[PDB]
């Protein structure tokens, strides 16, 4: 009943993105959820296959994908090559490619995607990058960060990138002004630096929604490999799904 369709977007040079559309086919347009994996992840990592299917069963047209850096590394690209593809800027560029292909209806089964109702879900570092993309694109109607969100902070490319985009990447400023519904879910058993940044977000932008799951770690327990769900991932899923469905279209 859940259909999974592979796609590949060939980018410039040898860069490419492998992704999946996950969907229960009902011949109607379904709200879109585009999922971004974290810095240590990939589309087949940990809970992502489960999460993609979970949302497809709940009525979403789901896209998840390997960032460019992942396809480069599996192609055996140089260490400098992979490092420069690892910037936040490159996430935003990859995400722009994913969303352009969705909006031009080039992804599989795109006739069943409601591009008028697009949401982002970002894990860890991609929680900050998804907030940035959301803030910069009117067609993103809501964004959810899992154990991420605060501004992105051995890679010299990441240093140059963070240095040249100190204002653009300030998710604290962006969240204070973004009128779209944003949800940040944070596990209590994550590193303190992150938890500190999450309080600064909540103080900067109280208008948004902040959910803490005290006993959950940085992955809600769903690190690789994934044999079963956990209470914490299940909560994050139900809260995220309630957030999108109950608030997306509200004024």
Numbering used by the authors: 5 to 157, 163 to 260
Which of the paper's sentences describe this entry?
PsEst3, a psychrophilic esterase obtained from Paenibacillus sp. R4, which was isolated from the permafrost of Alaska, exhibits relatively high activity at low temperatures. Here, crystal structures of PsEst3 complexed with various ligands were generated and studied at atomic resolution, and biochemical studies were performed to analyze the structure–function relationship of PsEst3. The residues located in the active site, including the catalytic triad (Ser128, Asp199 and His227), were strictly conserved.
Four structures were obtained: a sulfate-bound form, the wild type bound to PMSF, a malonate-bound form of the S128A mutant and an apo form of the S128A mutant. The S128A and S128C variants were prepared to investigate whether PsEst3 exhibits the same mechanism as that of dienelactone hydrolase or a classical esterase. Mutational analysis revealed that the activities of both variants were <10% that of the wild type [Fig. 6(c)]. Structural superposition of the sulfate-bound structure and the malonate-bound structure of the S128A mutant with the apo structure of the S128A mutant revealed r.m.s.d.s of 0.4 and 0.3 Å, respectively, indicating that the overall conformational changes caused by the ligands were not critical.
